[PDB]
Symmetry: C2
Subunit: 263 residues, 2 copies
Amino acid sequence: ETCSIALVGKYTKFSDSYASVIKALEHSALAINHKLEIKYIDSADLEPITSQEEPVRYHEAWQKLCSAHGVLVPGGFGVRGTEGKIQAIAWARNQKKPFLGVCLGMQLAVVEFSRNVLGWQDANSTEFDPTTSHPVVVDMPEHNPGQMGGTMRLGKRRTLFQTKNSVMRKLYGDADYLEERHRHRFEVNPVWKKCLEEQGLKFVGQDVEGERMEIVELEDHPFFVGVQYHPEFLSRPIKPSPPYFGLLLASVGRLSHYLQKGC
Amino acid sequence: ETCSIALVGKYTKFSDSYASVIKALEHSALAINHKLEIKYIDSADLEPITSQEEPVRYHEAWQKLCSAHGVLVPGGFGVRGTEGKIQAIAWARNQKKPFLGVCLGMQLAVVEFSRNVLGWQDANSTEFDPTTSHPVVVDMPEHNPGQMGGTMRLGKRRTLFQTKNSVMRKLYGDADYLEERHRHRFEVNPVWKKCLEEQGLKFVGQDVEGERMEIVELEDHPFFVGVQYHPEFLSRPIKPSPPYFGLLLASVGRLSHYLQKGC
């Protein structure tokens, strides 16, 4: 069968911007031996602005979104489509659709959670709103010596698991730590993390310092995870990265059997 | 070209419930020599209940609605889909899409107008809500002698034009009056008609007594009319009835030329 995934984003207008991302998905598709459809949904088309402009595209986008087996909100740049992106996120969370967010997507997912769970509707990313009542996403650059100002976190870095009870950890193979590609500047405000700890939004991965959050796994959800690091760079046809493979498995509704079968 | 019309309704689930209605449309299609698509949109699919249930159908319905060239909200029975029906009406009014309402459709259109123009959001039909703050649609049956209780208005009755400046009148041929099929029980509450007279919702057709309203033409709209009477019964291939022909013409964006050309 053809499993379809809703690529939701900005730069998502078809381009090869996602060539290695789709290729990573292909690695998983080959492993599982299924077919793969990449839907290209401009997140903007998910917004009521579009409804006002061309509601054909508006409803078409959402129709496609629902028809997708899983959804992917990758990182991206620009305030554009943030609303549609978050709407898609909330949609997937409510509908218990396999959700993978990467970087920005993870960041927005946390904001979405705060807004529609903690009620902090004014929660926001300082990346786009400096006047945020609950600065969820905050600029946390690295300040290495010899550098003027901060710098984006980039490179192969080590991420530590905060717990054994982690689906991703299991997918990785019960590793105490993992090393992944990094490319990202904004991080979780710990001021609110602590307000998310009693919540079912659990943060699983952290940098070595134990400060920056890299993995989040929403509890009580078939598949709703977010990562900051970029695994598509390391995924290979032989060794596919697990967040895409796992997403695929969830998109299929195989994942539980998979793990049960023996991972 | 194929001109499509959005049949919005209950009983709209495909059936031949609308065989003479579509046939009337066919009469117009033949006159104009164009092709005709009948979309069958369950008005229920236009409601947020459906969004909650199956948003695929929800967005699909609205996608189809937008893709339609004109819309038809005919009469019908039952409270079911009233919301989606009204939503479609407001949509068409806002989007300036050719709108023809018949009986219930006309009735709901008036309510919609009151709600979203007069702000009388609790305006309603007493047919379904006896506790209505602004009883727009009220039960006004005929009370003929020998009858116990009232009766539905039914039969070929004469309708009088209230004005010369009427698009429909022009389509009819400047007739002082018209005789049409009737089948309907609820009427416009005159208590609010008088509040609609300073409005751009103009009532053009009336029964002989000058009490029951039969034709309404929304001003400043390419085509937004409602009738109580049922012209599809009298439409013939040779002499197609004009509200369907005119609707077609509007759906095409020919109507102004048509009248200009000489009607």
